[PDB]
Amino acid sequence: ALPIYYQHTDINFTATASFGGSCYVCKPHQVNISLNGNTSVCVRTSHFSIR
Amino acid sequence: YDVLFYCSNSSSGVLDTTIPFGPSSQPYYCFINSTINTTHVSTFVGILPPT
Ligand SMILES: *[C@@H]1O[C@H](CO)[C@@H](O[C@@H]2O[C@H](CO)[C@@H](O[C@@H]3O[C@H](CO[C@H]4O[C@H](CO)[C@@H](O)[C@H](O)[C@@H]4O)[C@@H](O)[C@H](O)[C@@H]3O)[C@H](O)[C@H]2NC(C)=O)[C@H](O)[C@H]1NC(C)=O
Ligand SMILES: *[C@@H]1O[C@H](CO)[C@@H](O[C@@H]2O[C@H](CO)[C@@H](O[C@@H]3O[C@H](CO)[C@@H](O)[C@H](O)[C@@H]3O)[C@H](O)[C@H]2NC(C)=O)[C@H](O)[C@H]1NC(C)=O
Ligand SMILES: *[C@@H]1O[C@H](CO)[C@@H](O[C@@H]2O[C@H](CO)[C@@H](O)[C@H](O)[C@H]2NC(C)=O)[C@H](O)[C@H]1NC(C)=O
Ligand SMILES: *[C@@H]1O[C@H](CO)[C@@H](O[C@@H]2O[C@H](CO)[C@@H](O)[C@H](O)[C@H]2NC(C)=O)[C@H](O)[C@H]1NC(C)=O
Ligand SMILES: *[C@@H]1O[C@H](CO)[C@@H](O)[C@H](O)[C@H]1NC(C)=O
């Protein structure tokens, strides 16, 4: 690529879950969803990657 | 209003006020300042090219 200073940020989209609220197979009891712990994450960098 | 554009080597824009010409050897961060009745609005804009 054409010349540019490298600058990178990490994001993970994470989920943590609980089951057995009244049953299994029916559904998850609860899932906690986050982007690096936030509800919103933006890239303000030249480079980025997401897990 | 007056609008002020300037750059610094570190991201702590408050520590310097420069313009690089020609080739660098490090990233430079560039910011915009503008003030409304002491409301010193200040923001990062971007990183300069290598040259
Ligand atoms: C764009 O707007 C920004 C938004 O606030 C400006 O940031 C401010 O910049 C001034 C200088 O850039 C900071 O100065 C502070 O000064 C105190 C006092 O100590 C200093 O002075 C004594 C006397 O000269 C000397 O002995 C000391 O060594 C110091 O040098 C410091 O204690 C602070 O640590 C600091 O440097 C402002 O706080 C600062 N804003 C922020 C958020 O920090 C920025 O200047 C504007 N950009 C331009 C180019 O005008
Ligand atoms: C993306 O998620 C991971 C998990 O939420 C958070 O980063 C993880 O940070 C550790 C510590 O910096 C990385 O290294 C690990 O260290 C332990 C202890 O020495 C070792 O057992 C593990 O093998 C490993 O080295 C872990 O690699 C890293 N995980 C990943 C997937 O990169 C990472 O902080 C997240 N992103 C953000 C923005 O937080
Ligand atoms: C989702 O997050 C909540 C909030 O972080 C978790 O429930 C908390 O669990 C701790 C430890 O048992 C309690 O002290 C808090 O009071 C609980 N918070 C609330 C609001 O009740 C929940 O367990 C997480 N759920 C999942 C699936 O990870
Ligand atoms: C950013 O540029 C400034 C210009 O002031 C650097 O500060 C000088 O660094 C040399 C080299 O590090 C010292 O010999 C000077 O005495 C320094 N300036 C002052 C006021 O002491 C600063 O190192 C630069 N780089 C970064 C990352 O801040
Ligand atoms: C957003 O994420 C950072 C992640 O390190 C965390 O400290 C912060 O408290 C989260 N934001 C909110 C509003 O909780």
Residues A20 and B14: their CA atoms lie apart, in Å, by 54
A28 beta partners:
none
Question: In angstroms, how far apart are the furthest CA atoms of chain B?
Answer: 38
Query: Which residues of chain B does A5 touch, with a Cβ-Cβ cutoff of 8 Å?
Result: 27, 47, 50
Polymer length in residues for chain B: 51
Minimal-distance CA residue to ligand 1 atom 44:
B14
Q: Would you call A19 helix, strand, or coil by DSSP? A: coil
Rounded to 5°, angle at Cα A9 from A46 and B10: 70
The DSSP secondary-structure symbol of B27 reads -
CA-CA distance, B20 to B15, in Å (whole number)? Answer: 15
Q: B38 touching A, CB under 8 A? A: no
DSSP state of B35: E
Are the beta carbons of A35 and A41 closer than 8 angstroms?
A: yes
